[PDB]
Design a protein around this ligand. Structure first.
Ligand SMILES: COC(=O)[C@H](Cc1ccc(Br)cc1)c1ccncc1
Ligand SMILES: [Cl-]
Ligand SMILES: [Cl-]
Ligand SMILES: [Cl-]
Ligand SMILES: [Cl-]
Ligand SMILES: [Cl-]
Ligand SMILES: [Cl-]
Length: 337
């Protein structure tokens, strides 16, 4: 057990191992890690065991962060608690590499820049999807980027109704079947988000900036066309089916006339991502082999994940049982090389 030291930073008490120095608020603090030599981000969880829902959410986040080991995905450098026993356990601290900016802060992007940024998102997604994990909240503010154009996916979907209401970026990247609760969704919702991000890097403009759910759906159907009978059968809500059928039918637009001047290979890839029927969208593994990425694709350096057991999600436990499982995962952590 390392030696811990205490300090109050902006009305927050922080008790951390001596290895972490020069803490600065950014609750989250930046620090220097004397063991690895990295600048790090330290997150102190707020009230992690205040309800059954919150205790389970804390366990879910720690299980996910402990699993992810990939160059294009956030990973765990350390996790600790100052507690010496389960009985006094109450605080959880998480540590990762400090990232300086997100995709917004960076975004004159050339076509070569778009190729490299989207390639890295897809490489990370192939890894995440191989473990049967769905991100669900891909958007520019959840992508960290450095000076060398290297990128990481973070802030997995572990959102409220007020959060998704009106003219908000929280909704502009969401697949339509999840925005309107059309059906049980799967990992293909993440490919829709990648298409929206790619379009915005190419044009400089948000692709579907709707003023509400309905205005956004109208923008989407104008580009990709109204649904046919095949997809309509897959919408489980009779209510949503009736609404869709009230709209005048529209053909799919010509993407070469929408994305004027873009690389034709980028136009082709966007057509394969932005498909209304989620069963027919290109997968992450398929997209990495697309000719747009010929300068970067290496099938021997695009790894998959170890399997990920999510059976706890269907389990009903008390607060202290979720808390004891979390304590076990804290003390069993083994750091990366
Ligand atoms: C928007 O993203 C954030 O605010 C996270 C906070 C965060 C810290 C540690 C862990 Br482990 C998980 C998350 C962040 C990650 C890296 N660099 C800065 C901040
Ligand atoms: Cl230490
Ligand atoms: Cl504690
Ligand atoms: Cl965003
Ligand atoms: Cl057109
Ligand atoms: Cl799995
Ligand atoms: Cl597992």
């Amino acid at each position: 057990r390392p030696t811990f030291y205490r300090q109050e930073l902006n009305k927050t008490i922080w008790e951390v191992p001596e290895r972490y120095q020069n803490l600065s608020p950014v609750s989250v603090c930046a620090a220097f890690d004397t063991k690895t030599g990295h600048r790090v981000a330290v997150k102190k969880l707020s009230r992690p065991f205040q309800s059954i829902i919150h205790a389970k959410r804390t366990y879910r986040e720690l299980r996910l962060l402990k699993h992810m080991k990939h160059e294009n995905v956030i990973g765990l450098l350390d996790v600790f608690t100052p507690a010496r026993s389960l009985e006094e356990f109450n605080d959880v601290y998480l540590v990762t590499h400090l990232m300086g900016a997100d995709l917004n802060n960076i975004v004159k992007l050339t076509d070569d820049h778009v190729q490299f940024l989207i390639y890295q998102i897809l490489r990370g997604l192939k890894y995440i999807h191989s473990a049967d994990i769905i991100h669900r909240d891909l958007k520019p503010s959840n992508l960290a980027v450095n000076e060398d154009c290297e990128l990481k996916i973070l802030d997995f979907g572990l959102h409220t109704d007020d959060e998704m209401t009106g003219y908000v970026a929280t909704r502009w990247y969401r697949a339509p079947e999840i925005m309107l609760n059309w059906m049980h969704y799967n990992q293909t919702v993440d490919i829709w988000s990648v298409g929206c991000i790619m379009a915005e890097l190419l044009t400089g403009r948000t692709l579907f900036p709707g003023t509400d759910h309905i205005d956004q759906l109208k923008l989407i159907l104008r580009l990709v066309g109204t649904p046919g009978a095949e997809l309509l059968k897959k919408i489980s809500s009779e209510s949503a089916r009736n609404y869709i059928q009230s709209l005048a039918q529209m053909p799919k637009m010509n993407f070469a006339n929408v994305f004027i001047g873009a690389n034709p290979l980028a136009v082709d890839l966007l057509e394969k991502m932005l498909v209304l029927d989620s069963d027919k969208r290109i997968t992450a593994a398929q997209a990495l082999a697309h000719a747009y990425f010929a300068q970067y694709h290496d099938p021997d350096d695009e790894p998959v994940a170890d399997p990920y057991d999510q059976s706890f999600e269907s389990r009903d436990l008390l607060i202290d049982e979720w808390k004891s499982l979390t304590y076990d995962e804290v003390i069993s952590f083994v750091p990366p090389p």
